[PDB]
Design a protein around this ligand. Structure first.
Ligand SMILES: NS(=O)(=O)c1ccc(C(=O)NCc2cccc(F)c2F)cc1
Ligand SMILES: [Hg+2]
Ligand SMILES: [Zn+2]
Length: 258
């Protein structure tokens, strides 16, 4: 019926309902570090999340989103390859059933345990709905998660997963600081792409950070205990909610570092 990540409604089937799946600037892609162009004109990212107002966390089937109040320029992203101000609307993760898979983007074919996506929308468009209809409507900050030492800033997220085990569940999630999920360095790669889930709109400027953050095995394990299904339905563990790398086509991956 609806799309998913299973054998019968997974990524290989999406093109039937969303023709854009075989488009020209689809994501994710493999970042070949030896062919990525170091661009001296790329400016440093400006991540201002000091006034971020998280509101709730919900399991929407597919993944879990932490939503933010984007009624005003509270948490924004500017700089880098971006033009204008982009407001943070939500963040979510993609992870695997095993530590050796989970990320959507790969670096030199290397997959990480998971990938964090901080989704922002261009303010010049007034609302997210309009922004998705534009080639530069969204900017997603992608951060790789590697299994190692626990990330303290991620623990609040992990503790609440129990209350949103199944599809449709949500819980109040206020006062969460997104800054706790950032690596030390903001060096990044960038390329024009798309949403990695249906509708797969090609409205995204991807900003993938070079430095991954580390999370403990216990932290990643809790992600894996979530359910794709809603209460009262057969249990399907929410794992491997990632889309395989797509062809780069006529695109150039630029790097903010040499
Ligand atoms: N993993 S990712 O960062 O690429 C990604 C980010 C956001 C969304 C999203 O907001 N989807 C819902 C959505 C999007 C467009 C139009 C809609 F109607 C809608 F519901 C999907 C994928
Ligand atoms: Hg678009
Ligand atoms: Zn995502």
């Amino acid at each position: 019926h609806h799309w998913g990540y299973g054998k019968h409604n997974g990524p290989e089937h999406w093109h039937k309902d969303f023709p854009i799946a075989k488009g020209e600037r689809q994501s994710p892609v493999d970042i070949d570090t030896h062919t990525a162009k170091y661009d001296p004109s790329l400016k440093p990212l400006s991540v201002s999340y000091d006034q971020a107002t998280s509101l709730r966390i919900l399991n929407n089937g597919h993944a879990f989103n932490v939503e933010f109040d984007d009624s005003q320029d509270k948490a924004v992203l500017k700089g880098g390859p971006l033009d204008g101000t982009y407001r943070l609307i939500q963040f979510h993760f993609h992870w695997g059933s095993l530590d050796g898979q989970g990320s959507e983007h790969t670096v030199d074919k290397k997959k990480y345990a998971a990938e964090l996506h901080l989704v922002h929308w261009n303010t010049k468009y007034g609302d997210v709905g309009k922004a998705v209809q534009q080639p530069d409507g969204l900017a997603v900050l992608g951060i790789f998660l590697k299994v190692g030492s626990a990330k303290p800033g991620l623990q609040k997220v992990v503790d609440v997963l129990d209350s949103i085990k199944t599809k449709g569940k949500s819980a109040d999630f206020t006062n969460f600081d997104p800054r706790g999920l950032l690596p030390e360095s903001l060096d990044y790669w960038t390329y024009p792409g798309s949403l990695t889930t249906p509708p797969l709109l090609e409205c995204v400027t991807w900003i993938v950070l070079k430095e991954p953050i580390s999370v403990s095995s216990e932290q990643v394990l809790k992600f894996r205990k979530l359910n794709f299904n809603g209460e009262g339905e057969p249990e399907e563990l929410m794992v491997d909610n990632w889309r395989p790398a797509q062809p780069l086509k006529n695109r150039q991956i630029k790097a903010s570092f040499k």
